[PDB]
Amino acid sequence: ERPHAEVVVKGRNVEVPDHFRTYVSEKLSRLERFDKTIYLFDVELDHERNRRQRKNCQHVEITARGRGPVVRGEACADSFYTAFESAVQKLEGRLRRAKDRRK
Amino acid sequence: GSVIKKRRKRMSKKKHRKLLRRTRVQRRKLGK
Amino acid sequence: KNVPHGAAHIKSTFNNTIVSITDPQGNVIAWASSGHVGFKGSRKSTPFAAQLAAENAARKAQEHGVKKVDVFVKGPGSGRETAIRSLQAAGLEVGTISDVTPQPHNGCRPPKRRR
């Protein structure tokens, strides 16, 4: 199931350098590491582009399939890196908890 | 009563303790 | 040879159950357990194992020539009286019951707690 993590990279309207793609696929491999139950990872990279913003420029929705229970991690930050890492850590909480309750 | 306070105390204590476990040799066989 | 009347010891615990027939002197004739009945591991705390084990041993004692029994029980047993019913089903006369589970007078240290 190791390349079976169905990567889904995407951005509605953002300048998306293709090294962000490297970042995303690597940070998702990082949790392939400790969850061997994975089918789908739909992911977004969104941008509200309002003027005089409320401290939260970029946004991310993430959802993942497991055997039955699906996982959901949403995040928000100024740029790509805090968004990636924050949604990653929220998924890590979810998945530590899920593999603690799995048994 | 809380335990946050006692925990910060405990952590400082522990780190100093482990430092002394690691320097039990050098302290003795230096400061004579 | 044979003995018409003897005694029976029944040791029921959390994870197993076992019996043994014996003279009042202490000389066994016949015994059985859930391991010889066939169950294994974790199934053999149930009273059904007690039924089958006591039944087999009682029939062995019927073979070696027993007709009446004294009965002595010991330990945490879900199926004590279940084994008793099995014995009295097997065609044996219940002599005398006694619930001697060995209690100490606050002696040797037991192990610690689990979780």
Binding site: - | - | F39, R43, T46, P47, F48, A49, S78
Partner: protein, 155 residues
């Protein structure tokens, strides 16, 4: 039904035979509303049995039902790290019903070229004590024997 159950439907009697297990049978073999097709299949098969045996097919039917109808079955439960199967007694209603379900679903995968023939031969085979229905019922009793140990649950 957290508040409570509701009644069962009042089966009709058969216009021809005088038995409501037959209307139960057509309603269990039914598929896609073709009740009259079920009816004519069943009547043809039972009359095939009549010419096979020289007598009423209903008696051999109920004899087959006496063969394949259990009164004990399984009911699982998840407990303590390993899900346990448990024997549970079965009231005659669901006994007959599940027996008929076995009967149909193991009739369908036969090779008499036609449902009417498959079904009739299965019924005869079960009256005789050979059908896969009987086989599965024996497997059920085998399981109950293997798991008598869990009756003290009484559930």
């Amino acid at each position: 039904p957290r508040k409570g159950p509701a009644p069962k439907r009042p089966l009709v009697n058969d216009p021809v035979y005088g038995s409501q297990l037959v209307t139960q049978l057509v309603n269990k073999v039914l598929l896609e509303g073709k009740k009259s097709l079920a009816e004519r299949i069943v009547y043809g098969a039972l009359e095939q049995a009549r010419e096979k045996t020289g007598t009423d097919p209903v008696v051999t039917l109920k004899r087959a039902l006496d063969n394949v109808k259990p009164a004990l079955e399984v009911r699982s439960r998840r407990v303590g790290g390993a899900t346990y199967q448990v024997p549970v007694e079965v009231r005659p209603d669901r006994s007959t019903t599940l027996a008929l379900r076995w009967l149909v679903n193991f009739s369908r995968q036969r090779r008499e070229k036609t449902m009417v023939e498959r079904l009739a031969n299965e019924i005869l085979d079960a009256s005789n004590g050979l059908g896969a229905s009987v086989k599965r019922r024996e497997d059920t009793h085998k399981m109950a024997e293997a798991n008598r140990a869990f009756a003290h649950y009484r559930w």
